[PDB]
């Protein structure tokens, strides 16, 4: 019942978050907000899809997002 457009859109947003610059404090504030919405969207898909594919969206991408988050928290101190 998960559509390809929901999967495509999630990954599109993820890609944009990753390609983002993070040079200024404003950018970092925005990226962090975006990370939170991506975690939520990943887990939404993961729960709806139910190595099995669903584990990537339930666990792996939220873990990678958390990683990127800590890093961005590393700069802004």
Numbering used by the authors: 178 to 227, 240 to 266
Q: What does the paper behind this entry write?
A:
Stl is a DNA-binding protein that binds to the intergenic promoter region between stl and str (the SaPI transcription rightward regulator), preventing transcription of the str and downstream genes, thus maintaining integration of the island in the host chromosome. In this way, SaPIbov1 Stl presents three domains: one corresponds to an HTH N-terminal domain required to recognize and bind the divergent stl-str region present in the SaPI genome; a second (middle) domain responsible for interacting with the trimeric Duts, while the C-terminal part of the protein recognizes the dimeric Duts.
Therefore, we determined to solve the structure of BovI-Stl by eliminating this region and dividing the protein into two functional and complementary portions corresponding to the N-terminal (BovI-StlN-ter; residues 1–156) and to the C-terminal part of the protein (BovI-StlC-ter; residues 175–267). Likewise, we solved the structure of BovI-StlC-ter to 2.2 Å resolution. BovI-StlC-ter is also an α-helical domain forming an antiparallel three-helix bundle. We have named these helices as α11, α12 and α13 to follow the BovI-StlN-ter numbering. Nine residues (230–238) that correspond to a loop connecting α11–α12 were disordered, as well the three initial residues and the last one. Around 800 Å2 of total surface area would be buried per monomer upon BovI-StlC-ter dimerization, suggesting a stable dimer that was confirmed by size exclusion chromatography (SEC) analysis.
